[PDB]
């Protein structure tokens, strides 16, 4: 009521895009929206769709 | 009168009625038995490779449309045309790079379209020509501006790089080395032809 | 304090112009340093 | 004394940057320089990086 905490529902592979590293820009816009409100939380659903482990390459 | 274009766009379809500062490929036409059989294979394989250039335009337009209507700020040089207009007949022309006196910076700048209208006429015998145009897009990123514009135009640069990694496929690469030696021989004969005539 | 080694934090992975910027920027102020973080991102 | 073994020295991928078309023209001017000055030795330091595997 005094500080409305926001939410940011983001999925895994929608951030990972075609282009080259515009997948960075899809979270740069999120991070500059994270300083729109001060009480802002970032929910990354399926973070292994973004950052999985080195296997052999 | 004629168009005041400084870029070397010209081929069999059109775009030859131009005049630039540096080198120019104006081409419709400008012992004897080797020259006339040369002209015969020139007409034949120039028609076939011109159809191949138009096919390359067809498979280039599918990314060219998105990359030309997405961004517009790099579809125009930061230095406007009239400063280079009075150098045809502040800014000084060296080998091909234009120099500005007030800062001293060196620009190879296009209007982010010098590719579609080059393939309108067509002299893209190899995909290394499209590689060089996307590298000139990187050069337009590199030469002018602060960090944000450089990294964003390098992002669009590498988008077109990720596209030309799909256009450059080894069957088309070997066909383009065949017509690359053919067109190397073509540009050599055409320079000696425009010197002798 | 009559000189000052200047810090330069750099991550691991375009990158070549930023490489020229960090290398020439450390070579105009001669007391300086170059630090790279996660070099295997730039050298696998 | 009167003939010159002219020594050209290159480094590990000094020819090879990430731009594709510069290494080609650099090698063309390299071998053309080798063909003009006729006795010539070309050195490729760290050729496991210029020709990696």
GROMACS .gro file of C-alpha atoms in nm:
model
  351
    1UNK     CA    1   0.000   0.000   0.000
    2UNK     CA    2   0.291   0.239   0.057
    3UNK     CA    3   0.545   0.054  -0.163
    4UNK     CA    4   0.378  -0.159  -0.431
    5UNK     CA    5   0.628  -0.434  -0.511
    6UNK     CA    6   0.616  -0.516  -0.881
    7UNK     CA    7   0.667  -0.844  -1.065
    8UNK     CA    8   0.851  -0.939  -1.383
    9UNK     CA    9   0.753  -1.276  -1.530
   10UNK     CA   10   1.014  -1.378  -1.787
   11UNK     CA   11   1.050  -1.717  -1.954
   12UNK     CA   12   1.363  -1.902  -2.062
   13UNK     CA   13   1.411  -1.919  -2.438
   14UNK     CA   14   1.213  -1.610  -2.539
   15UNK     CA   15   1.512  -1.403  -2.428
   16UNK     CA   16   1.751  -1.621  -2.632
   17UNK     CA   17   1.684  -1.481  -2.978
   18UNK     CA   18   1.806  -1.521  -3.335
   19UNK     CA   19   2.012  -1.223  -3.405
   20UNK     CA   20   2.354  -1.222  -3.241
   21UNK     CA   21   2.351  -1.076  -2.888
   22UNK     CA   22   2.022  -0.891  -2.896
   23UNK     CA   23   1.937  -1.151  -2.631
   24UNK     CA   24   2.149  -0.917  -2.418
   25UNK     CA   25   1.925  -0.624  -2.517
   26UNK     CA   26   1.609  -0.816  -2.421
   27UNK     CA   27   1.743  -0.816  -2.063
   28UNK     CA   28   1.897  -0.467  -2.084
   29UNK     CA   29   1.543  -0.336  -2.132
   30UNK     CA   30   1.437  -0.549  -1.833
   31UNK     CA   31   1.717  -0.413  -1.614
   32UNK     CA   32   1.637  -0.052  -1.700
   33UNK     CA   33   1.273  -0.131  -1.623
   34UNK     CA   34   1.396  -0.273  -1.291
   35UNK     CA   35   1.497   0.081  -1.190
   36UNK     CA   36   1.157   0.222  -1.286
   37UNK     CA   37   1.008   0.105  -0.958
   38UNK     CA   38   1.243   0.065  -0.670
   39UNK     CA   39   1.073  -0.251  -0.519
   40UNK     CA   40   1.121  -0.461  -0.833
   41UNK     CA   41   1.195  -0.835  -0.852
   42UNK     CA   42   1.307  -1.022  -1.163
   43UNK     CA   43   1.166  -1.372  -1.212
   44UNK     CA   44   1.360  -1.576  -1.468
   45UNK     CA   45   1.162  -1.892  -1.538
   46UNK     CA   46   1.375  -2.175  -1.685
   47UNK     CA   47   1.719  -2.022  -1.642
   48UNK     CA   48   1.880  -2.330  -1.797
   49UNK     CA   49   1.721  -2.212  -2.121
   50UNK     CA   50   1.958  -1.915  -2.084
   51UNK     CA   51   2.271  -2.054  -1.914
   52UNK     CA   52   2.346  -2.428  -1.930
   53UNK     CA   53   2.674  -2.603  -1.852
   54UNK     CA   54   2.978  -2.646  -2.078
   55UNK     CA   55   2.953  -3.001  -2.213
   56UNK     CA   56   3.218  -3.035  -2.486
   57UNK     CA   57   3.214  -2.717  -2.699
   58UNK     CA   58   2.182   1.621  -6.528
   59UNK     CA   59   2.344   1.296  -6.416
   60UNK     CA   60   2.317   1.160  -6.064
   61UNK     CA   61   2.575   1.290  -5.816
   62UNK     CA   62   2.662   0.947  -5.678
   63UNK     CA   63   3.005   0.870  -5.534
   64UNK     CA   64   2.958   0.494  -5.482
   65UNK     CA   65   3.071   0.247  -5.757
   66UNK     CA   66   2.730   0.095  -5.831
   67UNK     CA   67   2.700  -0.033  -6.187
   68UNK     CA   68   2.628  -0.346  -6.388
   69UNK     CA   69   2.440  -0.502  -6.680
   70UNK     CA   70   2.087  -0.404  -6.575
   71UNK     CA   71   2.141  -0.033  -6.517
   72UNK     CA   72   2.304   0.231  -6.298
   73UNK     CA   73   2.579   0.312  -6.548
   74UNK     CA   74   2.474   0.673  -6.609
   75UNK     CA   75   2.677   0.798  -6.311
   76UNK     CA   76   3.005   0.976  -6.224
   77UNK     CA   77   3.202   0.922  -5.902
   78UNK     CA   78   3.524   1.044  -5.744
   79UNK     CA   79   3.715   0.713  -5.725
   80UNK     CA   80   3.702   0.399  -5.947
   81UNK     CA   81   3.381   0.321  -6.137
   82UNK     CA   82   3.235   0.014  -6.307
   83UNK     CA   83   3.035   0.166  -6.590
   84UNK     CA   84   2.959  -0.127  -6.818
   85UNK     CA   85   2.748  -0.206  -7.115
   86UNK     CA   86   3.042  -0.224  -7.356
   87UNK     CA   87   3.281   0.049  -7.232
   88UNK     CA   88   4.477  -0.994  -8.238
   89UNK     CA   89   4.106  -1.005  -8.327
   90UNK     CA   90   3.993  -1.370  -8.321
   91UNK     CA   91   4.073  -1.416  -7.951
   92UNK     CA   92   3.897  -1.084  -7.883
   93UNK     CA   93   3.580  -1.184  -8.069
   94UNK     CA   94   3.561  -1.530  -7.908
   95UNK     CA   95   3.628  -1.344  -7.581
   96UNK     CA   96   3.329  -1.119  -7.651
   97UNK     CA   97   3.117  -1.427  -7.733
   98UNK     CA   98   3.192  -1.600  -7.403
   99UNK     CA   99   3.152  -1.260  -7.233
  100UNK     CA  100   2.794  -1.224  -7.362
  101UNK     CA  101   2.703  -1.587  -7.284
  102UNK     CA  102   2.850  -1.625  -6.935
  103UNK     CA  103   2.761  -1.264  -6.849
  104UNK     CA  104   2.395  -1.345  -6.917
  105UNK     CA  105   2.416  -1.664  -6.706
  106UNK     CA  106   2.602  -1.498  -6.419
  107UNK     CA  107   2.365  -1.198  -6.439
  108UNK     CA  108   2.073  -1.436  -6.384
  109UNK     CA  109   2.275  -1.574  -6.091
  110UNK     CA  110   2.313  -1.218  -5.955
  111UNK     CA  111   1.936  -1.169  -5.978
  112UNK     CA  112   1.886  -1.499  -5.793
  113UNK     CA  113   2.129  -1.366  -5.530
  114UNK     CA  114   1.915  -1.050  -5.508
  115UNK     CA  115   1.609  -1.274  -5.455
  116UNK     CA  116   1.774  -1.462  -5.169
  117UNK     CA  117   1.919  -1.139  -5.023
  118UNK     CA  118   1.594  -0.939  -5.018
  119UNK     CA  119   1.444  -1.168  -4.750
  120UNK     CA  120   1.678  -1.026  -4.487
  121UNK     CA  121   1.737  -0.693  -4.661
  122UNK     CA  122   1.374  -0.585  -4.613
  123UNK     CA  123   1.377  -0.647  -4.236
  124UNK     CA  124   1.720  -0.490  -4.192
  125UNK     CA  125   1.624  -0.182  -4.394
  126UNK     CA  126   1.289  -0.110  -4.225
  127UNK     CA  127   1.409  -0.194  -3.873
  128UNK     CA  128   1.673   0.082  -3.858
  129UNK     CA  129   1.674   0.409  -4.052
  130UNK     CA  130   1.940   0.618  -3.876
  131UNK     CA  131   2.218   0.432  -4.061
  132UNK     CA  132   2.034   0.468  -4.392
  133UNK     CA  133   2.188   0.818  -4.419
  134UNK     CA  134   2.548   0.935  -4.369
  135UNK     CA  135   2.608   1.173  -4.076
  136UNK     CA  136   2.784   1.415  -4.312
  137UNK     CA  137   2.532   1.531  -4.570
  138UNK     CA  138   2.584   1.508  -4.944
  139UNK     CA  139   2.636   1.875  -5.037
  140UNK     CA  140   2.977   1.888  -4.867
  141UNK     CA  141   3.090   1.613  -5.104
  142UNK     CA  142   2.903   1.765  -5.401
  143UNK     CA  143   3.144   2.058  -5.441
  144UNK     CA  144   3.438   1.814  -5.452
  145UNK     CA  145   3.305   1.668  -5.779
  146UNK     CA  146   3.383   1.968  -6.001
  147UNK     CA  147   3.659   2.158  -4.524
  148UNK     CA  148   3.659   1.815  -4.691
  149UNK     CA  149   3.947   1.681  -4.902
  150UNK     CA  150   3.958   1.363  -5.114
  151UNK     CA  151   4.265   1.138  -5.068
  152UNK     CA  152   4.280   0.792  -5.235
  153UNK     CA  153   3.908   0.726  -5.158
  154UNK     CA  154   3.869   0.829  -4.789
  155UNK     CA  155   3.728   1.184  -4.737
  156UNK     CA  156   3.910   1.392  -4.473
  157UNK     CA  157   3.750   1.660  -4.255
  158UNK     CA  158   3.968   1.947  -4.135
  159UNK     CA  159   3.795   2.033  -3.805
  160UNK     CA  160   3.837   1.693  -3.635
  161UNK     CA  161   4.042   1.471  -3.867
  162UNK     CA  162   3.819   1.163  -3.883
  163UNK     CA  163   3.798   0.916  -4.169
  164UNK     CA  164   3.464   0.786  -4.299
  165UNK     CA  165   3.379   0.505  -4.545
  166UNK     CA  166   3.006   0.574  -4.508
  167UNK     CA  167   2.710   0.437  -4.706
  168UNK     CA  168   2.336   0.487  -4.664
  169UNK     CA  169   2.270   0.127  -4.559
  170UNK     CA  170   2.120   0.040  -4.898
  171UNK     CA  171   2.417   0.037  -5.135
  172UNK     CA  172   2.364  -0.340  -5.150
  173UNK     CA  173   2.014  -0.376  -5.294
  174UNK     CA  174   2.078  -0.121  -5.568
  175UNK     CA  175   2.412  -0.282  -5.647
  176UNK     CA  176   2.224  -0.609  -5.696
  177UNK     CA  177   1.963  -0.418  -5.895
  178UNK     CA  178   2.235  -0.399  -6.159
  179UNK     CA  179   2.441  -0.691  -6.030
  180UNK     CA  180   2.815  -0.743  -6.002
  181UNK     CA  181   2.806  -0.966  -5.691
  182UNK     CA  182   3.003  -1.253  -5.841
  183UNK     CA  183   3.099  -1.379  -5.493
  184UNK     CA  184   2.940  -1.362  -5.146
  185UNK     CA  185   3.260  -1.187  -5.037
  186UNK     CA  186   3.109  -0.875  -5.197
  187UNK     CA  187   2.817  -0.897  -4.952
  188UNK     CA  188   3.078  -0.972  -4.683
  189UNK     CA  189   3.253  -0.648  -4.779
  190UNK     CA  190   2.928  -0.450  -4.771
  191UNK     CA  191   2.845  -0.580  -4.423
  192UNK     CA  192   3.205  -0.499  -4.324
  193UNK     CA  193   3.145  -0.148  -4.455
  194UNK     CA  194   2.836  -0.142  -4.233
  195UNK     CA  195   3.081  -0.219  -3.951
  196UNK     CA  196   3.304   0.061  -4.082
  197UNK     CA  197   3.012   0.305  -4.065
  198UNK     CA  198   2.967   0.185  -3.707
  199UNK     CA  199   3.338   0.226  -3.631
  200UNK     CA  200   3.424   0.563  -3.781
  201UNK     CA  201   3.171   0.799  -3.616
  202UNK     CA  202   3.011   0.822  -3.275
  203UNK     CA  203   3.030   0.718  -2.912
  204UNK     CA  204   3.012   0.370  -2.757
  205UNK     CA  205   2.635   0.302  -2.769
  206UNK     CA  206   2.592   0.367  -3.142
  207UNK     CA  207   2.905   0.162  -3.220
  208UNK     CA  208   2.788  -0.142  -3.024
  209UNK     CA  209   2.429  -0.123  -3.153
  210UNK     CA  210   2.539  -0.094  -3.515
  211UNK     CA  211   2.788  -0.375  -3.451
  212UNK     CA  212   2.487  -0.576  -3.330
  213UNK     CA  213   2.304  -0.506  -3.657
  214UNK     CA  214   2.635  -0.569  -3.841
  215UNK     CA  215   2.662  -0.912  -3.683
  216UNK     CA  216   2.294  -0.977  -3.757
  217UNK     CA  217   2.379  -0.931  -4.125
  218UNK     CA  218   2.690  -1.141  -4.059
  219UNK     CA  219   2.472  -1.420  -3.920
  220UNK     CA  220   2.268  -1.384  -4.239
  221UNK     CA  221   2.563  -1.403  -4.479
  222UNK     CA  222   2.683  -1.712  -4.289
  223UNK     CA  223   2.357  -1.862  -4.420
  224UNK     CA  224   2.389  -1.723  -4.774
  225UNK     CA  225   2.752  -1.839  -4.807
  226UNK     CA  226   2.721  -2.217  -4.855
  227UNK     CA  227   3.006  -2.425  -5.005
  228UNK     CA  228   2.823  -2.524  -5.326
  229UNK     CA  229   2.747  -2.158  -5.393
  230UNK     CA  230   3.101  -2.082  -5.271
  231UNK     CA  231   3.258  -2.310  -5.534
  232UNK     CA  232   3.027  -2.171  -5.804
  233UNK     CA  233   3.130  -1.823  -5.694
  234UNK     CA  234   3.501  -1.909  -5.710
  235UNK     CA  235   3.440  -2.031  -6.067
  236UNK     CA  236   3.270  -1.707  -6.163
  237UNK     CA  237   3.521  -1.521  -5.942
  238UNK     CA  238   3.811  -1.626  -6.162
  239UNK     CA  239   3.581  -1.556  -6.459
  240UNK     CA  240   3.503  -1.206  -6.331
  241UNK     CA  241   3.861  -1.137  -6.229
  242UNK     CA  242   3.948  -1.208  -6.594
  243UNK     CA  243   3.645  -0.995  -6.695
  244UNK     CA  244   3.755  -0.691  -6.493
  245UNK     CA  245   4.113  -0.725  -6.623
  246UNK     CA  246   3.998  -0.736  -6.987
  247UNK     CA  247   3.757  -0.449  -6.922
  248UNK     CA  248   4.025  -0.222  -6.772
  249UNK     CA  249   4.256  -0.289  -7.067
  250UNK     CA  250   3.958  -0.231  -7.300
  251UNK     CA  251   3.875   0.107  -7.148
  252UNK     CA  252   4.242   0.204  -7.171
  253UNK     CA  253   4.276   0.098  -7.535
  254UNK     CA  254   3.947   0.245  -7.663
  255UNK     CA  255   5.155   0.872  -0.507
  256UNK     CA  256   5.380   1.068  -0.746
  257UNK     CA  257   5.254   0.809  -0.995
  258UNK     CA  258   4.924   0.618  -0.999
  259UNK     CA  259   4.867   0.273  -1.148
  260UNK     CA  260   4.519   0.302  -1.297
  261UNK     CA  261   4.278   0.010  -1.263
  262UNK     CA  262   4.103  -0.142  -1.565
  263UNK     CA  263   3.847  -0.417  -1.504
  264UNK     CA  264   3.759  -0.621  -1.812
  265UNK     CA  265   3.527  -0.920  -1.851
  266UNK     CA  266   3.559  -1.231  -2.065
  267UNK     CA  267   3.344  -1.206  -2.381
  268UNK     CA  268   3.286  -0.631  -3.133
  269UNK     CA  269   3.545  -0.705  -2.865
  270UNK     CA  270   3.841  -0.597  -3.079
  271UNK     CA  271   3.760  -0.223  -3.078
  272UNK     CA  272   3.714  -0.237  -2.701
  273UNK     CA  273   4.048  -0.421  -2.694
  274UNK     CA  274   4.209  -0.133  -2.886
  275UNK     CA  275   4.042   0.113  -2.647
  276UNK     CA  276   4.177  -0.063  -2.338
  277UNK     CA  277   4.523  -0.109  -2.489
  278UNK     CA  278   4.570   0.246  -2.621
  279UNK     CA  279   4.397   0.400  -2.318
  280UNK     CA  280   4.652   0.232  -2.091
  281UNK     CA  281   4.927   0.368  -2.319
  282UNK     CA  282   4.850   0.738  -2.282
  283UNK     CA  283   4.880   0.733  -1.901
  284UNK     CA  284   5.195   0.522  -1.865
  285UNK     CA  285   5.133   0.434  -1.496
  286UNK     CA  286   4.840   0.198  -1.557
  287UNK     CA  287   4.737  -0.169  -1.556
  288UNK     CA  288   4.523  -0.407  -1.760
  289UNK     CA  289   4.314  -0.666  -1.575
  290UNK     CA  290   4.108  -0.937  -1.746
  291UNK     CA  291   3.839  -1.142  -1.574
  292UNK     CA  292   3.751  -1.496  -1.693
  293UNK     CA  293   4.015  -1.525  -1.965
  294UNK     CA  294   3.870  -1.860  -2.081
  295UNK     CA  295   3.569  -1.668  -2.210
  296UNK     CA  296   3.812  -1.495  -2.447
  297UNK     CA  297   4.065  -1.783  -2.470
  298UNK     CA  298   3.908  -2.132  -2.477
  299UNK     CA  299   7.728  -0.881  -5.063
  300UNK     CA  300   7.546  -0.852  -5.397
  301UNK     CA  301   7.252  -1.093  -5.349
  302UNK     CA  302   6.999  -1.053  -5.070
  303UNK     CA  303   6.824  -1.333  -4.887
  304UNK     CA  304   6.543  -1.097  -4.790
  305UNK     CA  305   6.373  -1.220  -4.473
  306UNK     CA  306   6.003  -1.153  -4.415
  307UNK     CA  307   5.871  -1.231  -4.068
  308UNK     CA  308   5.505  -1.272  -3.976
  309UNK     CA  309   5.349  -1.362  -3.643
  310UNK     CA  310   5.080  -1.597  -3.518
  311UNK     CA  311   4.764  -1.477  -3.697
  312UNK     CA  312   4.907  -1.131  -3.752
  313UNK     CA  313   4.773  -1.189  -4.103
  314UNK     CA  314   4.451  -1.336  -3.960
  315UNK     CA  315   4.213  -1.096  -3.788
  316UNK     CA  316   3.838  -1.150  -3.772
  317UNK     CA  317   3.784  -0.961  -4.098
  318UNK     CA  318   3.788  -1.214  -4.381
  319UNK     CA  319   3.917  -1.009  -4.674
  320UNK     CA  320   4.226  -0.856  -4.513
  321UNK     CA  321   4.422  -1.181  -4.461
  322UNK     CA  322   4.378  -1.268  -4.829
  323UNK     CA  323   4.517  -0.939  -4.962
  324UNK     CA  324   4.794  -0.945  -4.700
  325UNK     CA  325   4.904  -1.290  -4.822
  326UNK     CA  326   4.882  -1.171  -5.184
  327UNK     CA  327   5.112  -0.874  -5.118
  328UNK     CA  328   5.335  -1.108  -4.914
  329UNK     CA  329   5.386  -1.358  -5.195
  330UNK     CA  330   5.411  -1.079  -5.454
  331UNK     CA  331   5.690  -0.928  -5.244
  332UNK     CA  332   5.844  -1.276  -5.240
  333UNK     CA  333   5.818  -1.295  -5.618
  334UNK     CA  334   5.970  -0.952  -5.684
  335UNK     CA  335   6.277  -0.987  -5.459
  336UNK     CA  336   6.369  -1.329  -5.593
  337UNK     CA  337   6.576  -1.494  -5.311
  338UNK     CA  338   6.342  -1.467  -5.014
  339UNK     CA  339   6.260  -1.658  -4.695
  340UNK     CA  340   5.914  -1.618  -4.540
  341UNK     CA  341   5.878  -1.696  -4.170
  342UNK     CA  342   5.548  -1.773  -3.997
  343UNK     CA  343   5.608  -1.756  -3.622
  344UNK     CA  344   5.352  -1.956  -3.419
  345UNK     CA  345   5.208  -2.136  -3.722
  346UNK     CA  346   5.001  -2.356  -3.491
  347UNK     CA  347   4.788  -2.044  -3.436
  348UNK     CA  348   4.792  -1.911  -3.791
  349UNK     CA  349   4.691  -2.260  -3.909
  350UNK     CA  350   4.508  -2.404  -3.606
  351UNK     CA  351   4.353  -2.747  -3.565
   0.00000   0.00000   0.00000
